[PDB]
Amino acid sequence: LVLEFLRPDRQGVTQQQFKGALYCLLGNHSGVCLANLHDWDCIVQTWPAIVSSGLSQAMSLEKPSIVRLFDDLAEKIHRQYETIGLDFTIPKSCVEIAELLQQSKNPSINQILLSPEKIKEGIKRQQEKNADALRNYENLVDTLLDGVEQRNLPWKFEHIGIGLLSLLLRDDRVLPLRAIRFFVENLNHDAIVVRKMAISAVAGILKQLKRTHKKLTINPCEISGCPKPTQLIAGDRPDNHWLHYDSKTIPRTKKEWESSCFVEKTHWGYYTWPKNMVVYAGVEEQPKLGRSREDMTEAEQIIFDHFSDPKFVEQLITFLSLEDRKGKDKFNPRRFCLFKGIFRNFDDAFLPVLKPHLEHLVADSHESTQRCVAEIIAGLIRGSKHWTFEKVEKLWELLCPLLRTALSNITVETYNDWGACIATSCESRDPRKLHWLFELLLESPLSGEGGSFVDACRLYVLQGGLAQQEWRVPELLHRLLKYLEPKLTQVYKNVRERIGSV
Amino acid sequence: GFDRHITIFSPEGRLYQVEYAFKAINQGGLTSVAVRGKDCAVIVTQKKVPDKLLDSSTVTHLFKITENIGCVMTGMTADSRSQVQRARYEAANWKYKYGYEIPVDMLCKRIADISQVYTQNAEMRPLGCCMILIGIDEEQGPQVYKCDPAGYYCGFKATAAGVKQTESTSFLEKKVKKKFDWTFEQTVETAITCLSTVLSIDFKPSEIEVGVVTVENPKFRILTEAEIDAHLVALAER
Amino acid sequence: GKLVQIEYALAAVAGGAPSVGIKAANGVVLATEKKQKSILYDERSVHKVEPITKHIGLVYSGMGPDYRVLVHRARKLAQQYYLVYQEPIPTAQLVQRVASVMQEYTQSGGVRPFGVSLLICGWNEGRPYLFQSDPSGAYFAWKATAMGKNYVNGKTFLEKRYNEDLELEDAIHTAILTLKESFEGQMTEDNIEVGICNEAGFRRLTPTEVKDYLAAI
Amino acid sequence: LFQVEYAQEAVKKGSTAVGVRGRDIVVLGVEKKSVAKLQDERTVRKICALDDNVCMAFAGLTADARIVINRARVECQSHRLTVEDPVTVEYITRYIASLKQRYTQSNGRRPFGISALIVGFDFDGTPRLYQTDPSGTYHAWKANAIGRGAKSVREFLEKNYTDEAIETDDLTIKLVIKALLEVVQSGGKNIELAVMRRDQSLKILNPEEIEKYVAEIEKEKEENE
Amino acid sequence: HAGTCLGILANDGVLLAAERRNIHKLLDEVFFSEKIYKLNEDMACSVAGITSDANVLTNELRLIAQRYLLQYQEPIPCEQLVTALCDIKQAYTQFGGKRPFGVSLLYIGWDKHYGFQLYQSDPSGNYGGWKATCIGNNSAAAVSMLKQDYKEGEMTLKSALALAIKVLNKTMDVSKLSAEKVEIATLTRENGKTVIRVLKQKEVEQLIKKHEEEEAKAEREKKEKEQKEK
Ligand SMILES: O=P(O)(O)O[C@H]1[C@@H](OP(=O)(O)O)[C@@H](OP(=O)(O)O)[C@@H](OP(=O)(O)O)[C@@H](OP(=O)(O)O)[C@H]1OP(=O)(O)O
């Protein structure tokens, strides 16, 4: 009945009735929203209706109150939304306790034990309800998608619909393929607000489309050859030595790369070994990279086709390059998540298309162009975790020159963004795998070719990477101390402060 | 918040200090009644001399603003004298500037306009006094007008000020609703009966002070104790 | 705080007696409720609706002493323009000048803002003009407006009744109807004050004229 | 006290300005920050001519600088009207420092909030460089820097400043460019340089001219390597 | 952010386009003149504020220009007019016993010294020269849109008007752009005289029609491209 007032087809609805119905749908500050009701059946009716209210004819966006109500309805829905079921099966263990509760004397009403036929009926209804919930979820995505594509819908309503669609990312199921196409296509939508909403959604879609990686239980004592002391000794020990970064240890070969354990996370091994320790499976067991696109699933194919097309990438790079706020812009980790997902899922399939853009972005000294490349570089390095040795070596041959040019061009506006890129790339990774970058920033941080301030920025980016690898780089920290000790009395104030921090 | 301390708006939209000024008028403990008859206007106020030592002539609440205009002041006495001096100056200035005597309505507006300034500006407190001006307007006949600390002014067929103003207004309303235009004797009787009923005093001539203006004699006249006694004795024999 | 004082001043206007302004093709009508508290009060002694010039008149909802200060300033501003340009002041010009005085009181310290909202009607160049000025000093041009108690209810009633083409006589009737909606007791010629602006200029309808309009309704 | 400290924070955030006093040329160089994609750079200056013989570079709040610069310019003309002589660089600095000491209102952000490097030539022909502070203290310096990276630039200037460095007008311009180049990284894109000269009007070098000097310093660095 | 005001500078002219919004049905269209007030013969301004706020600021700006004309008998250069008002705004903010002006203004003008120019003044009293800029409601979306579509040194008044209609359509909360709800003024030099002309409703309507048909052609091409891909 409340939805009838905001129906677009209904005529003679009047401004007052439409405004009143929106207030009923908004709800009280405390109480039933009536538009965010948990049940899918209620949400499927309310969400499309709000989006299609734009064509109502009783809607005056020109009046300020109507816009405030629509913004409040969207804000309340976003703040009070919670994921809604989709599967409600109850485990057998719970039913056994329930049967005992039915069969309990004292405060007991005599009742027949549930018939086997009755128990079967309950299972059938629950299966129907869960199937019905899934049907509603797919319809809500389809109906909301129809609303946003309406020929004559005010822009505000399209924005409200795209936000509602973003709330429908599930985490238990991949998004309907039509929605995946809309979000990848809307990555380059003219509105920045829609573009940011698409970036967040596509990064989530990439996690849904991610293929699981196998893991192998390992004995830390066996690989080290150490006895693994019973007492809880903490810090560097004989058993933890392999994790430490050593120049001789770095694999630098295809055979050595396959042989090395590559533990990854920094915390493992410092205080005690976990009862079960997993080092990841061998490359052959792990999901095959470099698929031909015939193998890729339809959802993966949609992301692949758009990213592969040169024009789509060129537009995306230009939109990413544009400044949004002057002096308030930052790394934006959501952009890093999108790139890390693309590289991890597609194994550098789009690396040739992105290569011309990356070279140009590094050359340009503009703060915005440098920020965009930094996010891609951080995602490219992080996405390379499960890549084969041949692929990782190729990425580094391209990356080492571009990073050197970027560090040379580091400026007050972009110094923080470059520090974030190095820190994000270094975090959660084995130091031995990232040996190319560690050598790159440690070769001559205080070269002095850039000048003071540039030297301090280069020392700062190196400091961020060393901090991320904690205790797993006994060398490198020693090498930096040796490099810094002669220059301690030869540095200006900006460098001196950075030397003190490092 | 200082809303109560100074004359600035409260969250409700009310200025408390003006309300406190109204409380001050009642603090004196004296009540004044003014009635407008067909041919005359009369003012009666209770006069209390607390000490035998005080000279009776000096204690008065009835003042002559101009030859044809007289007033009754209810409230803080020093504030009353301040308003009376301002009204007298305004009346003289009007005759000098415009060549004719100020109308009673115009004089009440001028005092009320000065009263508004006190409500708007924090530095000056509102004056806790009520001015009732009686005069004969040549064009519109006898006129009774009352000025408030709020700066409001209005013309009244009959009006009261002081501790018993609410009770006095109720007695006056009944007489005004019924009856007819009153003669001078009836108008003086109405004011004295109203004050006597509210305060239950059976006033002796010394207790009440009476001021009158008539169409026949426009000049303001304060009745002598004997004249007040003649009205009181006539009221007793009725 | 000055902004908070303005909000508080607006509250006093809302608590004030209801006043209605309607602009029609041939004239503007300004109507106000003037219920005397007691039979003792003399109805003819004080007038809520006041002329500023031959063609300009104003009505208010809020504190009356504050309203009087503005009417004196408005009358002075009209005379100053007449002396310099030898022509009646445009209503829009007067409203801009009256608004500036209210802004001065809000900006200054040690002085509370005015607690009165002014509805100003004028006729210049053969066009009716109706304007509203706030304690803040903001002014808006309104085809119809209601101020004071139940202003929100009155304004919605005005929306249904108002027609783009209306005669002044019809406009007077709807203005009286708007006051009737929020009138607690019987409406009489003494209870309501009505002022009309036309090509002739602002005039306060005599109580006898008000009685005739009330009888028709 | 607190107001003076707040003003000092504003100057520290300001664009770096370096000045060198040379035998025949006083050079003022200020870093030019990027503005916005659709903005026009003509409005932003940071180097202003107080008079024919005096030039000023400011780091601090832009609005406060406009008021101080206008008041100083009116004073220079008033001094010329009263005494018939060009203002001494010290006299204009003293006036600006006094204006900083009093904003003309009790409290009311009395420190102006701009630190100024004032460079120019006296009627005698003596080159002069002075620094003004929000506190109202004014000092004379052979070379000095204000704004971001000022302390680091000063140390470079202390080592670099020498009789050889100020020997020729080109060398003095190069010294200003090298010191600015440490705080601001780029070629001529982010640097604005003004040369007062001797008995000549202030000249702001065109972007092409500054790039040529920037190119020469790079060639000297390569030869030094 | 009372109302959106958008200025675009083009090689042949500068244009100020401003939203016209009716908060209440009973409000009259006396203030429909809205922005593009006309400071002088060569300058015009748009205020992101209530009409009462605009009148005090516009009247002061007109007085400054007239004072310049009385002394020099030549029109005030555009930068000087903006700088003088900004100094008054700064003084109110800087001095303790004053409240800073809350209105942001957009200025379009032609001067002999720098030609057609567009400027923005913040409530702070700081001004900037902008090739294109927006103030008022939904300013952020417009500035992002302007940066994406503005071509520096290739803009023409006709291209600028088309960009304005496109950016206004996607930033203003009108729902459907109409000639009544948008006001556009153009400053151009004809002969030796600067001409400020508010575009007529019929002319503005034609621009909206050209934008609508162009959008339809793009939509038709997009559907055809999808069909070709299928
Ligand atoms: O084992 P999973 O649950 O699948 O997730 C892990 C792990 O997450 P947890 O340590 O929380 O279990 C990592 O760390 P997070 O940063 O996600 O906490 C890692 O992330 P990095 O790549 O940043 O190291 C990556 O998660 P993802 O790659 O999805 O971000 C990885 O998942 P895989 O086993 O799929 O690599």
Side-chain angles (χ1 to χ4, degrees), chain A residues 1-28 31-38 40-59 61-64 66-67 69-107 109 114-116 118-131 133-165 167-189 191-199 201-213 215-220 223 225 227-229 232-245 249-257 259 261-283 286-287 289-291 293 296-297 299 301-307 310 312-329 331-346 349-363 366 368-389 391-407 409-412 414-416 418-424 426-427 429-469 471-474 476-502, chain B residues 1-9 11 13-37 39-51 53-56 58-122 124-137 140-167 169 171-178 182-188 190-195 197-201 203 205 208-215 217-224 226-236, chain C residues 1-6 8-99 101-103 105-107 109-116 118-124 126-163 165-166 168 170-198 200-217, chain D residues 4 7-8 10-11 14-99 101 103 107-108 110-114 116-136 138-162 165-182 184-185 187-188 190-191 193-198 200 202-217 221, chain E residues 2-31 33-49 51 53-59 61-92 95-97 100-138 140-175 177 179-202 204-218 227:
Chain A
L1 287 96
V2 303
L3 289 187
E4 286 166 6
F5 298 108
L6 33 132
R7 180 168 302 184
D9 188 32
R10 226 274 198 90
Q11 27 77 35
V13 268
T14 83
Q15 289 279 343
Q16 285 83 210
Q17 295 176 26
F18 188 81
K19 190 175 185 180
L22 293 181
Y23 275 117
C24 302
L25 277 192
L26 180 60
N28 265 352
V32 270
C33 184
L34 285 189
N36 216 12
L37 288 178
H38 227 241
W40 283 108
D41 304 357
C42 303
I43 219 184
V44 168
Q45 302 163 13
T46 61
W47 281 14
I50 288 301
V51 177
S52 306
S53 297
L55 349 135
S56 80
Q57 106 198 356
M59 201 270 311
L61 210 49
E62 36 269 7
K63 292 182 55 183
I66 296 297
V67 1
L69 250 167
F70 276 113
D71 285 332
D72 286 339
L73 217 0
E75 181 185 353
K76 197 178 184 198
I77 282 173
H78 279 242
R79 72 170 177 262
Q80 298 184 359
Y81 181 72
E82 302 157 0
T83 18
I84 314 146
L86 225 55
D87 261 337
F88 298 102
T89 65
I90 308 182
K92 197 177 179 176
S93 307
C94 198
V95 323
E96 261 87 74
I97 320 288
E99 193 171 5
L100 298 178
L101 190 70
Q102 303 168 5
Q103 301 162 344
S104 295
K105 298 305 149 295
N106 298 354
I109 40 167
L114 287 167
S115 307
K118 296 184 62 59
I119 304 173
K120 295 176 182 183
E121 290 170 355
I123 304 175
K124 293 175 182 181
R125 289 173 170 265
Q126 179 54 243
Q127 288 169 347
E128 289 160 354
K129 289 171 186 168
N130 71 48
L134 185 47
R135 170 202 338 268
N136 287 327
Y137 159 73
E138 295 173 2
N139 292 167
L140 222 210
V141 174
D142 295 345
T143 319
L144 278 181
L145 275 171
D146 294 354
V148 300
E149 75 193 7
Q150 284 280 352
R151 232 293 305 268
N152 291 330
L153 181 82
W155 62 273
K156 188 195 203 60
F157 293 81
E158 186 212 13
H159 286 43
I160 295 176
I162 299 171
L164 295 183
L165 275 164
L167 258 45
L168 295 175
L169 285 167
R170 201 63 214 165
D171 117 274
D172 314 308
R173 269 181 42 94
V174 289
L175 206 59
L177 310 181
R178 190 190 180 187
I180 297 190
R181 195 173 308 106
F182 169 80
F183 279 128
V184 73
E185 195 178 353
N186 275 45
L187 262 177
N188 50 26
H189 188 266
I192 179 67
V193 202
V194 177
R195 175 183 330 157
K196 294 182 180 307
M197 243 165 277
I199 287 177
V202 290
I205 294 171
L206 286 162
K207 159 150 290 301
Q208 287 173 162
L209 262 311
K210 184 191 59 176
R211 297 175 293 173
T212 63
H213 299 275
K215 277 170 288 297
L216 174 68
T217 306
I218 203 200
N219 181 21
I223 167 69
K228 193 190 292 179
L232 288 183
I233 321 183
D236 309 343
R237 290 173 305 180
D239 52 358
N240 314 339
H241 204 261
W242 95 85
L243 292 91
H244 291 93
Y245 180 100
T249 309
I250 303 166
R252 286 147 60 181
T253 321
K254 182 181 179 57
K255 181 181 181 179
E256 301 192 33
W257 193 269
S259 174
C261 295
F262 293 140
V263 153
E264 294 292 315
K265 291 262 187 167
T266 171
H267 62 113
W268 298 128
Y270 187 87
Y271 186 88
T272 187
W273 283 113
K275 183 179 182 179
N276 240 216
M277 176 66 195
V278 278
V279 281
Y280 272 116
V283 46
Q286 303 281 21
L289 46 109
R291 292 170 291 176
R293 181 205 175 265
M296 297 182 182
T297 72
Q301 251 168 329
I302 297 173
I303 312 177
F304 180 89
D305 295 347
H306 280 78
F307 272 82
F312 172 93
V313 149
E314 180 172 352
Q315 190 55 239
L316 185 59
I317 291 308
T318 62
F319 274 159
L320 259 40
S321 298
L322 183 98
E323 63 176 34
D324 299 340
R325 288 295 184 268
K326 193 60 179 54
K328 317 174 184 179
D329 272 358
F331 195 68
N332 197 4
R334 271 178 182 91
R335 285 188 178 183
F336 156 81
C337 290
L338 160 63
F339 284 108
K340 191 187 71 177
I342 279 292
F343 296 126
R344 170 201 60 195
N345 285 175
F346 297 99
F350 315 123
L351 161 122
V353 192
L354 274 159
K355 254 181 51 64
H357 297 97
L358 287 180
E359 298 158 3
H360 163 257
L361 252 38
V362 127
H366 303 274
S368 312
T369 59
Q370 294 284 272
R371 207 171 317 269
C372 170
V373 60
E375 300 145 355
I376 312 180
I377 299 311
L380 208 16
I381 300 175
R382 281 266 286 250
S384 82
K385 172 169 61 171
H386 291 122
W387 292 4
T388 188
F389 178 72
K391 294 288 297 184
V392 305
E393 220 176 9
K394 294 174 183 180
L395 183 59
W396 288 104
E397 70 86 23
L398 162 78
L399 288 198
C400 291
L402 287 182
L403 282 179
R404 286 171 186 264
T405 31
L407 291 188
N409 294 164
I410 208 168
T411 177
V412 42
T414 74
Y415 94 95
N416 213 6
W418 288 116
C421 162
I422 300 305
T424 51
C426 186
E427 188 176 355
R429 290 294 175 267
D430 194 289
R432 296 173 285 113
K433 269 188 166 174
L434 269 51
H435 71 97
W436 291 273
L437 88 88
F438 287 128
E439 298 307 314
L440 212 63
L441 16 92
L442 199 51
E443 51 195 2
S444 53
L446 313 184
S447 72
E449 302 177 358
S452 258
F453 191 85
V454 179
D455 286 356
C457 298
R458 290 156 66 183
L459 196 62
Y460 169 73
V461 304
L462 159 72
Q463 158 187 322
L466 291 183
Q468 300 301 323
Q469 289 313 128
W471 83 256
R472 296 198 57 182
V473 272
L476 262 44
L477 286 182
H478 265 288
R479 295 175 45 181
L480 226 218
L481 175 59
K482 185 175 303 179
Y483 182 85
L484 292 173
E485 274 169 332
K487 323 281 184 177
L488 245 48
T489 78
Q490 311 167 2
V491 282
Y492 289 143
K493 187 207 177 57
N494 37 22
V495 193
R496 275 165 189 163
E497 180 262 326
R498 296 286 167 88
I499 292 190
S501 311
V502 79
Chain B
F2 277 82
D3 300 346
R4 283 170 159 90
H5 295 101
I6 66 184
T7 47
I8 59 172
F9 281 110
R14 283 154 63 258
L15 313 159
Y16 296 107
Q17 282 278 304
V18 154
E19 311 182 6
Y20 303 158
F22 273 84
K23 302 254 188 61
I25 297 172
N26 305 354
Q27 218 82 12
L30 295 177
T31 311
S32 326
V33 166
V35 31
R36 183 173 61 90
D39 288 353
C40 66
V42 20
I43 282 183
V44 67
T45 177
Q46 48 161 338
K47 64 168 305 175
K48 296 191 315 183
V49 191
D51 290 348
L53 294 179
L54 229 149
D55 196 12
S56 66
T58 205
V59 38
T60 175
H61 290 273
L62 266 154
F63 302 97
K64 192 170 299 181
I65 308 303
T66 91
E67 189 73 28
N68 298 350
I69 302 177
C71 84
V72 68
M73 296 306 291
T74 334
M76 307 179 58
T77 38
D79 296 13
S80 299
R81 307 296 190 92
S82 168
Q83 256 194 9
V84 163
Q85 195 76 3
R86 189 58 193 266
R88 291 171 164 183
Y89 160 74
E90 290 298 334
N93 192 215
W94 183 287
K95 181 74 177 61
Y96 175 80
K97 290 183 60 180
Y98 317 112
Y100 68 99
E101 178 172 347
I102 189 165
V104 213
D105 36 295
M106 290 293 104
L107 185 55
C108 213
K109 189 177 185 178
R110 271 296 302 168
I111 297 306
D113 286 331
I114 305 303
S115 304
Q116 196 270 352
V117 181
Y118 303 138
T119 194
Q120 205 139 22
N121 298 356
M124 309 166 301
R125 62 166 175 87
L127 253 53
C129 280
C130 221
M131 182 173 279
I132 302 182
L133 288 162
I134 57 160
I136 306 291
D137 195 39
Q140 305 174 11
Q143 275 187 343
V144 171
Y145 271 80
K146 178 162 113 290
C147 160
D148 287 359
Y152 279 101
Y153 78 105
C154 185
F156 293 89
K157 316 180 79 61
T159 187
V163 264
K164 301 281 99 181
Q165 71 147 2
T166 302
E167 317 189 357
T169 50
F171 179 99
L172 286 173
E173 286 183 22
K174 303 169 187 178
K175 302 297 163 300
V176 165
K177 288 167 188 173
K178 64 191 179 182
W182 300 302
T183 190
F184 166 79
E185 233 70 21
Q186 290 174 183
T187 65
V188 181
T190 309
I192 300 174
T193 50
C194 178
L195 211 55
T197 299
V198 297
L199 290 150
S200 309
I201 298 206
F203 296 94
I208 29 179
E209 202 179 6
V210 185
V212 287
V213 279
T214 57
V215 162
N217 330 308
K219 306 179 179 301
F220 180 62
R221 167 178 58 258
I222 302 276
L223 294 189
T224 181
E227 265 171 326
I228 306 173
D229 187 42
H231 287 99
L232 263 39
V233 70
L235 221 43
Chain C
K2 298 309 175 179
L3 299 176
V4 221
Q5 281 292 118
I6 286 302
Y8 297 167
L10 285 164
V13 170
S19 47
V20 177
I22 302 191
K23 158 179 171 165
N26 51 354
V28 182
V29 55
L30 284 189
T32 197
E33 146 183 333
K34 48 170 318 176
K35 281 174 159 297
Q36 311 293 88
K37 300 290 188 56
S38 169
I39 191 63
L40 292 181
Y41 287 58
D42 195 38
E43 306 88 28
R44 276 82 72 256
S45 291
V46 173
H47 307 287
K48 318 269 297 300
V49 203
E50 294 275 8
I52 298 177
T53 348
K54 40 173 179 183
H55 66 307
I56 299 180
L58 90 165
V59 80
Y60 75 112
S61 61
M63 293 190 288
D66 286 46
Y67 165 67
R68 288 199 317 269
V69 171
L70 298 170
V71 314
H72 170 78
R73 300 297 299 266
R75 282 163 171 171
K76 283 197 57 183
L77 291 164
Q79 292 311 305
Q80 294 171 186
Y81 191 101
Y82 192 81
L83 287 188
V84 179
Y85 299 105
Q86 290 297 124
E87 68 176 4
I89 181 168
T91 308
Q93 275 289 136
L94 182 67
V95 178
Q96 171 180 168
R97 302 183 179 189
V98 173
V101 95
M102 286 175 310
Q103 199 178 203
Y105 287 72
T106 185
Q107 210 93 8
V111 33
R112 46 169 195 81
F114 286 111
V116 35
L118 293 177
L119 259 173
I120 306 104
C121 67
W123 179 276
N124 34 298
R127 180 182 305 178
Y129 290 94
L130 176 63
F131 285 92
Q132 191 211 180
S133 73
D134 285 24
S136 57
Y139 40 106
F140 326 95
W142 288 94
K143 290 169 293 183
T145 348
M147 303 187 309
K149 277 186 257 55
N150 289 352
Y151 76 102
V152 237
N153 289 339
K155 284 171 62 182
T156 167
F157 170 83
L158 282 178
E159 295 170 14
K160 352 185 312 297
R161 297 306 177 95
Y162 181 76
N163 302 331
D165 292 351
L166 259 191
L168 188 48
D170 310 340
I172 303 166
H173 301 140
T174 161
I176 297 176
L177 254 311
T178 318
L179 284 183
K180 274 283 194 58
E181 238 72 32
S182 45
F183 224 74
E184 189 63 33
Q186 187 197 2
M187 180 178 292
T188 78
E189 350 92 11
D190 294 349
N191 285 348
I192 178 190
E193 210 162 26
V194 189
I196 59 154
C197 206
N198 47 2
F202 181 75
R203 187 174 57 92
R204 187 188 305 111
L205 286 180
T206 69
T208 318
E209 278 166 330
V210 174
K211 187 179 192 59
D212 307 339
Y213 286 108
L214 252 55
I217 289 150
Chain D
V4 186
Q8 290 160 356
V11 318
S15 302
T16 321
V18 328
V20 159
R21 171 185 65 90
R23 304 207 293 263
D24 294 338
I25 162 192
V26 274
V27 217
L28 226 39
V30 72
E31 82 102 351
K32 182 195 312 181
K33 31 165 46 67
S34 52
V35 264
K37 273 199 55 179
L38 259 297
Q39 201 171 165
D40 186 18
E41 50 172 346
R42 199 191 46 80
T43 62
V44 182
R45 280 162 280 267
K46 299 199 70 71
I47 286 181
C48 292
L50 256 41
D51 207 355
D52 58 323
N53 62 315
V54 175
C55 180
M56 167 177 156
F58 83 89
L61 297 176
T62 62
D64 295 337
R66 294 200 317 263
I67 309 305
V68 142
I69 291 164
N70 191 13
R71 290 280 310 272
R73 281 167 165 168
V74 90
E75 175 65 22
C76 293
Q77 304 301 323
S78 304
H79 174 93
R80 204 175 292 256
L81 203 44
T82 313
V83 122
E84 222 210 13
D85 285 347
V87 183
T88 317
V89 180
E90 180 191 2
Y91 180 78
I92 206 45
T93 311
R94 209 194 332 263
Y95 171 80
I96 294 178
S98 172
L99 192 54
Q101 176 70 42
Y103 214 92
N107 307 346
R110 252 196 303 103
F112 253 93
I114 44 103
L117 268 183
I118 312 171
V119 99
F121 269 81
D122 292 351
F123 203 21
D124 195 24
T126 313
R128 299 279 182 178
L129 169 61
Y130 284 76
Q131 186 206 188
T132 320
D133 290 336
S135 68
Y138 74 99
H139 331 268
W141 302 68
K142 321 167 186 176
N144 199 16
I146 53 178
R148 183 193 79 257
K151 304 198 186 58
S152 303
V153 166
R154 276 189 188 95
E155 299 178 357
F156 173 85
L157 279 172
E158 282 161 3
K159 175 197 309 176
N160 287 59
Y161 196 88
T162 30
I166 66 180
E167 197 169 1
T168 92
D169 54 350
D170 292 359
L171 288 186
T172 73
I173 296 170
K174 288 177 184 184
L175 180 56
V176 169
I177 298 204
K178 290 158 57 181
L180 267 168
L181 271 216
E182 285 198 336
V184 63
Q185 38 278 152
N190 286 342
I191 176 191
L193 190 123
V195 163
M196 253 284 308
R197 280 275 183 263
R198 162 91 123 273
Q200 290 187 23
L202 170 78
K203 176 194 178 184
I204 165 163
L205 263 63
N206 300 350
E208 179 55 51
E209 314 183 14
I210 70 200
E211 188 58 55
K212 184 213 63 176
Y213 281 102
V214 165
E216 288 156 339
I217 76 184
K221 205 269 179 54
Chain E
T4 118
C5 305
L6 184 115
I8 304 182
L9 164 65
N11 304 340
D12 55 341
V14 239
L15 52 103
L16 254 174
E19 162 190 40
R20 185 193 274 94
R21 209 178 195 180
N22 221 191
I23 310 303
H24 198 96
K25 164 198 170 182
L26 265 313
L27 271 166
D28 205 17
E29 35 72 46
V30 172
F31 300 125
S33 59
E34 266 271 323
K35 306 317 143 181
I36 63 229
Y37 287 97
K38 259 187 62 69
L39 300 186
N40 80 348
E41 321 289 329
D42 309 3
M43 273 270 282
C45 102
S46 287
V47 177
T51 64
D53 315 341
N55 280 358
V56 25
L57 268 302
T58 59
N59 294 352
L61 271 167
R62 294 160 164 174
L63 190 51
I64 304 169
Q66 292 306 311
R67 279 163 172 173
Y68 185 99
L69 179 71
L70 188 66
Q71 301 181 17
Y72 303 103
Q73 293 298 134
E74 280 187 347
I76 186 160
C78 311
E79 194 172 5
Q80 296 190 201
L81 190 50
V82 183
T83 309
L85 188 76
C86 281
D87 294 350
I88 311 175
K89 288 185 173 178
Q90 177 264 358
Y92 271 57
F95 286 118
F101 291 91
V103 274
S104 314
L105 320 182
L106 272 198
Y107 313 86
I108 57 163
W110 181 91
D111 63 342
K112 34 177 171 180
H113 314 103
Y114 310 110
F116 302 104
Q117 282 158 132
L118 163 69
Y119 288 102
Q120 173 181 340
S121 172
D122 309 339
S124 69
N126 302 349
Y127 69 100
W130 291 82
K131 306 293 172 53
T133 188
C134 183
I135 66 176
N137 200 26
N138 301 321
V143 80
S144 175
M145 284 195 63
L146 280 174
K147 299 162 195 163
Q148 291 166 186
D149 310 321
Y150 189 92
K151 248 71 69 177
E152 308 222 357
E154 207 192 3
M155 292 305 292
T156 74
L157 191 77
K158 183 179 302 180
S159 306
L161 286 164
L163 219 179
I165 296 290
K166 175 183 179 57
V167 63
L168 279 171
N169 181 40
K170 297 287 297 182
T171 61
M172 218 175 349
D173 309 82
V174 284
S175 103
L177 232 193
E180 45 182 3
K181 288 175 296 181
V182 55
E183 203 184 7
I184 315 179
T186 174
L187 204 143
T188 43
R189 278 280 291 190
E190 270 74 23
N191 206 3
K193 175 203 314 179
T194 112
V195 179
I196 320 182
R197 186 172 57 96
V198 277
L199 269 308
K200 208 62 62 183
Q201 278 194 3
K202 181 64 62 182
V204 173
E205 167 198 358
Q206 197 271 335
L207 296 174
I208 303 174
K209 179 177 303 300
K210 180 71 61 186
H211 164 75
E212 213 58 46
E213 64 197 6
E214 185 59 44
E215 183 182 0
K217 184 58 182 300
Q227 182 65 35

